[PDB]
Paper text:
The envelop spike (S) glycoprotein of coronaviruses, a class I transmembrane protein, is responsible for receptor binding, membrane fusion, and viral entry. The functional cellular receptor for MERS-CoV has been identified as DPP4 (dipeptidyl peptidase 4, also known as CD26). The receptor binding domain (RBD) is located in the S1 domain of MERS-CoV spike and is responsible for binding to DPP42324.
Here we report the crystal structure of MERS-CoV RBD bound to the MERS-27 Fab. The complex structure was determined by molecular replacement to a resolution of 3.20 Å. In the crystallographic asymmetric unit, the RBD and Fab form two 1:1 binding complexes that are structurally similar with a root-mean-square deviation (RMSD) of 1.17 Å for all 638 Cα pairs. The model consists of residues Val381 to Lys587 of MERS-CoV RBD, Ala1 to Arg210 (light chain) and Val2 to Lys222 (heavy chain) of MERS-27 Fab, and two N-acetyl-D-glucosamine (NAG) molecules attached to Asn410 and Asn487 of RBD, respectively. The binding interface between MERS-27 Fab and MERS-CoV RBD buries a total of approximately 1384 Å2 of surface area, including roughly 408 Å2 of the heavy chain, 297 Å2 of the light chain, and 679 Å2 of the RBD. The MERS-27 Fab interacts with the C-terminal segment of the linking loop and β7 strand of the receptor-binding subdomain. A cavity is formed by the H1, H2, H3, and L1 CDRs between the MERS-27 heavy and light chains. The RBD Trp535 inserts into this cavity and interacts with the surrounding MERS-27 residues Tyr33, Tyr50, and Trp104 of the heavy chain and Tyr91, Lys93, and Pro95 of the light chain. Heavy chain residues Tyr33 and Tyr50 form hydrogen bonds with Asp539 and Glu536 of RBD, respectively. MERS-27 and DPP4 show steric clashes between the variable domain of the heavy chain and the propeller domain of DPP4 when they simultaneously bound to RBD. They bind to the receptor-binding subdomain from different directions, resulting in an overlap on an epitope of the receptor-binding subdomain that includes Trp535, Glu536, Asp539, and Tyr540 and that is relatively small compared with the large binding surfaces of MERS-27 and DPP4 on the RBD.
Numbering used by the authors:
A (entry chain H): 2 to 222
B (entry chain A): 381 to 587
C (entry chain L): 1 to 210
The structure:
């Protein structure tokens, strides 16, 4: 059982979007399928269900008549068609399924989600600078280095270290919104400083909304 | 000491299987006034008569009320063998009885409206031996066991409800199904009246 | 809509404690209420369905109770991985959720490891200067970070950012980024961020020369 959301991204206010959820391990139209949203940093809001076998729908007050939840028996997929989209519609959209064949109400199975930004703005790939350590480093102790991912739009950016093979010691900070109107975030990592001159630390930065991939070598000056 | 009928005039009346009970017991009532706030479509009695029901003095007077669609008039009577008296609401056959279907007119505005009419159309217990189904027929003056697993109003018409019971509760499954009838322009309701007389204590006389 | 009122909005307790989150519905919802746990950066996980029913694969230290209009989630014997936001959800009418409760785990005080990073030349060509200060794995969350260029306190030009509390050690991490122009940055010599925090005795200073 997996739920894979897709179809999100930047859209201008007034615009449209067809989010899609590919389901497996079960079959839609046996279950109640739902859509749940979550604004950034805010709490959860139910937006629509398409009932079980026979497909009756219903929606939230804030989205009624604009959003439209659909479904396809083959391709096992679920749709949310969002029209006349508002600034306030900005959220992560979760594709969620009923806990059981019969009417349930709650959900064990959520998808990873998909982000939908709504604003004028404009896409903009990030510049990716290194935050190099110091020769000053605790000789026989911990050192720290990292990426600075400055000036981009929209969210999200994914930063990984050494193709994900390095997780331990990593901190990727929340994005901040600079006065310009763009995002900027950083990612740091602690390492044994014995291993500075001996290991390659490379940060893999990813901005799918603009198709910017930068893998960057961070080393001592 | 006027009987308090106002709580009926305020809010969304429940579905039939969550029938709301008003118990009056030492007061003066003007029933033929209450009914004048509604458009009474049907008014059927049993061991009493609409005239007498409004006239007499009782020890006790029970008024049940709920949203109920006119279209199911045949399902709400003493004689009905339908799913309503089988699983939702059955009144006593040994106390004189009344059954009113009414409509709230544009006139009266303080009665909110559910999203649709629901009713439980099946209600069974699947006993823990894994092979017996025992239909849970509603007793008079009581709720179906299935009130605990069925939402205030059934969401969609086929909705099936299934719940596993603890060995305390008997240990099988409690299973149910609900049906819906589309909401009507003005709200339509059912009222059940149940009176008790004697034995020296008939102090629910009218005003 | 039906309004779920959850309380407290945020609460802090040490490992082993009992915690009780409360939910109130604006009408009877008959044990139709679920509880969810949302760990930093993930989908919610189902904890409790029914009003009291434990979804298999959640530890028995979670317990739900209540019916009608008043419900509690009760984690009792708090553990470091229970750091998350907890939501309640009624499914008696078209679904609505509680506003949220953040659960922080108390922990022995732990001083931040401060690191400072000059801007890289890459960025300096493009004419902007970002000096970053890092505070590392600390508790509690409250930490002051103020910049001092040429020993003059920089004002209104910094910007900090903190992580969600870590699951495997109950600590935080913070990054203030100071920005200038290449024109402005190349004007002064010594850049230093000054870090005061409850875990270290004197404010710590990490400095560098340009
Ligand atoms: C009862 O109420 C009705 C209102 O339609 C009124 O006409 C009638 O006179 C009342 N009777 C008494 C005895 O209060
Ligand atoms: C409201 O209008 C209905 C229409 O049938 C009428 O029967 C009733 O007497 C009116 N109610 C009042 C309080 O005047």
């Amino acid at each position: 059982v997996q739920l894979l959301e897709t179809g999100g991204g930047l859209v201008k206010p007034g615009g449209s979007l067809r989010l899609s959820c590919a389901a497996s391990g079960f079959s839609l139209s046996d279950y109640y399928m739902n859509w749940i949203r979550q604004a950034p940093g805010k709490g959860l809001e139910w937006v629509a269900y398409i009932s079980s076998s026979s497909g009756y729908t219903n929606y939230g007050d804030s989205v009624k008549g604009r959003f439209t939840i659909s479904r396809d028996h083959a391709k096992n997929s679920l749709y949310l068609q969002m029209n006349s989209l508002r600034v306030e519609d900005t959220a992560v959209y979760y594709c969620v399924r009923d806990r059981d064949d019969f009417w349930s109400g709650y959900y064990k199975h959520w998808g990873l989600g998909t982000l939908v930004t709504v604003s004028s703005a404009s896409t903009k790939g990030p510049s990716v600078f290194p935050l190099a350590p110091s020769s000053k480093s605790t000789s026989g102790g911990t050192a720290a280095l990292g990426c600075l991912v400055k000036d981009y739009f929209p969210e999200p950016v994914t930063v990984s270290w050494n193709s994900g093979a390095l997780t331990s010691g990593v901190h990727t900070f929340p994005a901040v919104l600079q006065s310009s109107g763009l995002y900027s975030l950083s990612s740091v990592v602690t390492v044994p400083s014995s291993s500075l001159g001996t290991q390659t630390y490379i940060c893999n930065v990813n901005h799918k909304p603009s198709n910017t991939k930068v893998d960057k070598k961070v080393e001592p000056k | 000491v006027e009987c308090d009928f106002s709580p009926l005039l305020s809010g969304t009346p429940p579905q039939v299987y969550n029938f709301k009970r008003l118990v009056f017991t030492n007061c003066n009532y003007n029933l033929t006034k209450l009914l004048s706030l509604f458009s009474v479509n049907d008014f059927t009695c049993s061991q009493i008569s609409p005239a007498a029901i409004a006239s007499n003095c009782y020890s006790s007077l029970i008024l049940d009320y709920f949203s109920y669609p006119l279209s199911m008039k045949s399902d709400l009577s003493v004689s009905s063998a339908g799913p309503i008296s089988q699983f939702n609401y059955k009144q006593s056959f040994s106390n004189p009885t009344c059954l009113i279907l009414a409509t709230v007119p544009h006139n009266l505005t303080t009665i909110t409206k559910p999203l649709k009419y629901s009713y439980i159309n099946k209600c069974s217990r699947l006993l823990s031996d894994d092979r017996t189904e025992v239909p849970q027929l509603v007793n008079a003056n009581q709720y179906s066991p299935c009130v605990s697993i069925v939402p205030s109003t059934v969401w969609e018409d086929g909705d099936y409800y299934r719940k596993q019971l603890s060995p305390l509760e008997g240990g099988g499954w409690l299973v149910a199904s609900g049906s819906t009838v589309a909401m009507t322009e003005q709200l339509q309701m059912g009222f059940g009246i149940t009176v008790q007389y004697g034995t020296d204590t008939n102090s629910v006389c009218p005003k | 809509a039906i309004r779920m009122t959850q309380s407290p909005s945020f609460l802090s307790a040490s490992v082993g404690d009992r915690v009780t989150i409360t939910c109130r519905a604006s009408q009877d919802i008959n044990s139709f209420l679920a509880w969810y746990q949302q760990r930093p950066g993930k989908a919610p996980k189902l904890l409790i369905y029914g009003a009291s029913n434990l979804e298999t694969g959640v530890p028995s230290r979670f317990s739900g109770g209540g019916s009608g209009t008043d419900f509690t989630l009760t984690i009792s014997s708090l553990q470091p991985e229970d750091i998350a936001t907890y939501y309640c959800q009624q499914y008696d009418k078209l679904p609505t959720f509680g506003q949220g409760t953040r659960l922080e785990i108390k922990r022995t005080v732990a001083a931040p490891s401060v690191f400072i990073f000059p801007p890289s030349d890459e960025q300096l060509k493009s004419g902007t200067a970002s000096v970053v200060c890092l505070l590392n794995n600390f508790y509690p969350r409250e930490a002051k970070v103020q910049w001092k260029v040429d020993n003059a306190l920089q004002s209104g030009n910094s910007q900090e950012s903190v992580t969600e509390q870590d699951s495997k050690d109950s600590t935080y991490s913070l990054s203030s980024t100071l920005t200038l122009s290449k024109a402005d940055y190349e004007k002064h010599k010594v850049y230093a961020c000054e870090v005061t925090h409850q875990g270290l005795s004197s404010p710590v200073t990490k400095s560098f020369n340009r």
